[PDB]
């Protein structure tokens, strides 16, 4: 281990994390960018805010720090603290209440080669415009946009790993369904500098809501207090029961608005067809 | 003058944590793993989130750290910051507030011979998928993920401790003295296993796990007291509107009516508790 | 960290020489590399027969442009070549060899690179 | 279209002398060239990439020079272990490559 001592204490001795890690300054990083979806936390239809646990691998070569293994012992990677070296400063630029950019600071993986790997996790809470058209029945497309915020295009440049995420490692969810997942790098350069282009990669999931919690829940009793409400005007008018009948299915509806509004997303985008067939129960009884 | 300063010269002046402590490169490193559980303090049902509070055990060997009591006279053990050593760096992989290390970073004990035992604290929020088909009368099982979050199973692996009497510790230790069962939760099973994948060639450099299993039951005497029970005596209530008179004082549609709207406020009730 | 060749060490003629290359603790889905191949006989020295960047870009020496298919798997994290219409002349040691690409940025003129 | 061609094809020396190898481009190429060094049974090993810069861990003794259609690879002071043979490399923008013949330093007797 002495071997990756005195190599640690060379290759530091006049490095600077400050500057990017390239040779030239007219060269570009290339980062390698990687999204592995570990958890979908919870989606929250109120304030449109996703929050899922990632893993965000980012790849890129140091140019101060190579070594030849036969020097050291034949030592050819190491694990250094990312605090100690430049990274990337990817930021998740549609983040709704959370953290902008990594705050767990875990070790990279360098290599004697230069290439080093750190894959940090992170609790992305990103803003997601949620569609309440279809509710309980909705499809939602939430993207996380990622870029680095303090670099334009012409410094560092980033690439997906690949076309897809990686839902390798991804916990089953019991309210949604990942359909589809894809990332998509954008390039925009502004007519004011045309020498800066800003680069993101933005990847989006569409998912569909498990609806059966709805439907046992909200859907069936409406169903049955609309289907009890027609059967008062089979009841004699002599029995002197028909308003009672019909003002207690109105209670009874009454006391599940308090299911309703605690459960209905309390949103003013559109009325949601839960909420229609809410309002259509009500006024027909 | 205190033999403690001179041994910790000794051991320290020329030390670092950040190489593993081992000869060659390609040495792996044993971890003896015994996790000890203190409270099962809850199981969030809406959130799917068990908190736990537990300590890790975790004993290893680290031959640069190696010293003789009769060379320092007669220390068998000496406590230093964990931040001064060499650490796996163990994390929990299945949390879910973002939380991976411990609550308390407490000093290892670094004995001769070259043994280190460092034995911190931790409260730990993990991921627990609550199977709902039976609740209140249900029981889960709760995953405990541990790893090192910086090397591979070619560095660092894993082996269960043993006790005294020589017989491996493969699951979660609880101190019956001072144990206090939780309110809601009984610990029926909590098997350990160490976990070995991604040995192939294509697939990298290996990697390793310990995964305990905490198989609990739930105590559903909360519910059946509070909501069960008289959910069914309400809905039974039905049945005795086939007695009444079908006359206009009968009150027979007031009964079956009526039921239903309490049955209504049960389901308002309920709702506050099921998972989602 | 190490880069792994393999294949059958004899090939009759008019076969296809098919060769693989395996990476040892990395990944082949990084832009900063193409993966190619490099064959040294003694009477022709070293020559650059293909390279294949991980989204499927290909480039080919001229000469062997029409026999020579490069190609990936991702999955296994493994880059091969297939040499068609193999004659006497293909008899060599046929490496596998990471080409690096720097990336430099030019004023109006976007990115021009370095192997 | 580049054609590379090295110079001498065949190079005695001994310890101590200062070497040369010479390569030559067909056309104006400007410092996009590199020089590796192959010992016997071996895959080659970068020495010099853009010309004139040295890669990390390469003996400082290795210079390289040429912005041109002519580019050197100098040894300052022979060792032992130097005899092998040194190739010159060229690429252009897109991953397209070139090698020369090569160029064998023998000890001299």
């Known amino acids: 281990s002495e071997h990756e001592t005195r190599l640690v204490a060379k290759l530091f001795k006049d490095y600077s994390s400050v500057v990017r890690p390239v040779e030239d300054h007219r060269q570009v990083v290339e980062v390698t960018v990687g999204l592995q979806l570990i958890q979908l936390i919870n989606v929250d239809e109120v304030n449109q805010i996703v929050t899922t646990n990632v893993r965000l691998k980012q790849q890129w070569v140091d140019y101060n720090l190579k070594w030849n293994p036969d020097d050291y012992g034949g030592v050819k990677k190491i694990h250094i603290p990312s605090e100690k070296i430049w990274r990337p400063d990817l930021v998740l630029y549609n983040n709704a209440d959370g953290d902008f950019a990594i705050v767990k600071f875990t070790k990279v993986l360098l290599q004697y080669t230069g290439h080093i790997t750190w894959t940090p996790p992170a609790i992305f809470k990103s803003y997601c415009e949620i569609i309440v058209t279809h509710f309980p029945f909705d499809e939602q497309n939430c993207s996380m946009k990622l870029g680095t915020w303090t670099y334009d295009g012409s410094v560092v440049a980033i690439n997906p790993e690949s076309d897809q995420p990686d839902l390798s490692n991804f916990m089953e969810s019991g309210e949604w369904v990942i359909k589809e997942s894809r990332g998509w790098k954008h390039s925009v350069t502004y007519s004011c500098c045309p020498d800066t282009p800003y680069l993101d990669i933005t990847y989006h999931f569409v998912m569909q809501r498990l609806p059966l919690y709805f439907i046992v829940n909200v859907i069936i009793p409406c169903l049955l207090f609309s289907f009890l409400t027609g059967l008062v005007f089979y009841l004699p008018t002599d029995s002197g029961e028909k308003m009672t009948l019909s003002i207690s299915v109105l209670l009874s509806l009454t006391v599940f608005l308090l299911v309703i509004v605690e459960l209905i997303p309390s949103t003013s985008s559109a009325v949601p067809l839960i909420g229609k067939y809410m309002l259509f129960t009500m006024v027909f009884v | 003058k205190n033999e403690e300063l001179r041994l910790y010269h000794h051991l320290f002046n020329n030390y670092d944590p950040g190489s593993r402590p081992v000869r060659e490169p390609e040495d792996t490193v044993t971890i003896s793993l015994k996790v000890t559980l203190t409270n099962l303090i809850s199981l969030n049902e809406k959130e799917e989130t068990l908190t736990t509070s537990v300590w890790i055990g975790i004993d290893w060997q680290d031959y640069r750290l190696n010293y003789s009591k009769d060379d320092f006279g007669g220390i068998e053990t000496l406590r230093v910051p964990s931040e001064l050593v060499w650490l796996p760096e163990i994390v929990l992989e299945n949390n879910i507030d973002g939380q991976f290390g411990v609550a308390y970073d407490a000093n290892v004990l670094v004995y001769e011979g070259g043994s280190v035992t460092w034995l911190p604290p931790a409260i730990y929020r993990s991921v627990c998928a609550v199977e709902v088909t039976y609740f209140p009368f249900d029981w889960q099982n709760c995953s405990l993920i541990f790893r090192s979050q910086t090397y591979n199973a070619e560095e660092v692996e894993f082996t269960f401790a043993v006790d005294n009497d020589g017989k491996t510790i493969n699951k979660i230790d609880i101190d019956t003295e001072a144990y206090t069962e939780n309110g809601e939760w009984a610990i029926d099973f909590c098997p350990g296993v160490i976990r070995r994948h991604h040995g192939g060639a294509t697939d990298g450099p290996g990697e390793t796990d310990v995964i305990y299993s905490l198989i609990i039951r739930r105590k559903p005497l909360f519910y059946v007291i509070n909501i069960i029970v008289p959910c069914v005596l309400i809905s039974g209530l039905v049945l005795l509107a086939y007695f009444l008179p079908a006359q206009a004082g009968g009150q027979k549609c007031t009964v079956s009516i009526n039921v239903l709207l309490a049955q209504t406020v049960f389901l308002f009730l309920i709702a506050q508790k099921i998972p989602e | 960290v190490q880069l792994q060749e393999s294949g059958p060490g004899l090939v009759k003629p008019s076969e296809t020489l098919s060769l693989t290359c395996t990476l040892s603790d990395g990944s082949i889905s990084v832009s900063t590399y193409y993966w190619g191949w490099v064959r040294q006989s003694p009477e022709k020295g070293l020559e650059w027969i293909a390279s294949?960047?991980?989204?499927?870009?290909?480039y080919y020496n001229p000469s062997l442009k029409s026999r020579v298919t490069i190609s990936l798997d991702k999955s296994k994290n493994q880059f091969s070549l297939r040499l068609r219409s193999v004659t006497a002349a293909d008899t060599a040691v046929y490496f596998c060899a990471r080409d690096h690409r720097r990336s430099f940025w030019g004023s109006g003129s976007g990115y021009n690179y370095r192997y | 279209d580049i054609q590379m061609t090295q110079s001498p094809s065949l190079l005695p020396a001994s310890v101590g002398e200062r070497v040369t190898i010479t390569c030559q481009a067909s056309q104006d190429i400007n410092n996009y060239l590199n020089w590796y060094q192959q010992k016997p049974g071996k895959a080659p090993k970068l020495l010099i990439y853009?010309?004139?810069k040295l890669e990390t861990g390469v003996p400082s003794r290795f210079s390289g020079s040429g912005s041109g259609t002519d580019f050197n690879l100098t040894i300052s002071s022979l060792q032992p272990e130097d005899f092998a043979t040194y190739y010159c490399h060229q690429y252009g923008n897109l991953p397209v490559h070139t090698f020369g013949q090569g160029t064998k330093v023998e000890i001299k007797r």
């Open positions: 853009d010309a004139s």
């Open positions: 294949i960047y991980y989204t499927g870009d290909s």
